[PDB]
Design a protein around this nucleic acid. Structure first.
Length: 150
RNA sequence: AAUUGAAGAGUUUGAUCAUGGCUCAGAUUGAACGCUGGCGGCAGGCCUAACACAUGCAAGUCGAACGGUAACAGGAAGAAG
């Protein structure tokens, strides 16, 4: 019931004294399938150590999302660095139809059938960060009615 | 009951993030070309030279408008084997 999946692995470099030194970065997202989404970055010298650090950071640093029946509630826009992201609840608008690196976080998030369209930059490290910010500041009808009295 | 509706990716760098262009994945067509080709249904078929046109048809009808008889088939009368 953990439901982990990796989005992006890259080879970064460092350029020391004698030549270059190549390191690998993972970027994974875990989530239970009912709210509870996390992402982790993690970087290491080989690929399986990188994904393992990424999963291990992603299992902690996990955020609650106030889902609807199987989906979002109201249309929400989350931004991070250069990466602006729209989402629309699509009240059984079948299938998760999101961009790459947004399909994954929305998939393990437990949502099933939203409409997305990322704008701006679509770097995978910042398009999540713009989905969680997004799903984090999406509030439910029992939270809005809690705030404003009824 | 009559709008249930939105996906990205590759490429600037030793690597990064951003900006930014180029390019790809889709659908479409009065299409052409290449390879191949069994049947049917429904549609479509000179986008260019509003260039030049052989030949055949594409606008005739009415005698219940009229003088009339060129034919065709009868009618009447005459003459002949």
């Amino acid at each position: 019931e953990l439901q982990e999946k990796l989005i992006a692995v890259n080879r970064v470099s460092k350029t020391v004294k004698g030549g270059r030194i190549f390191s690998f970065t993972a970027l994974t997202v875990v989530g239970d399938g009912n709210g509870r989404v996390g992402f982790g970055y993690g970087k290491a010298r080989e690929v399986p150590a990188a994904i393992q650090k990424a999963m291990e950071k992603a299992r902690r640093n996990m955020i609650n999302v106030a889902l609807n029946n199987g989906t979002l509630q109201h249309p929400v826009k989350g931004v991070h660095t250069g990466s602006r992201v729209f989402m629309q609840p699509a009240s059984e608008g079948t299938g998760i139809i999101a961009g790459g690196a947004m399909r994954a976080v929305l998939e393990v998030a437990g949502v099933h059938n939203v409409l997305a369209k990322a704008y701006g930059s679509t770097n995978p490290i910042n398009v999540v960060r713009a989905t969680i910010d997004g799903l984090e500041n999406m509030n439910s009808p029992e939270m809005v009615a809690a705030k404003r009295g009824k």
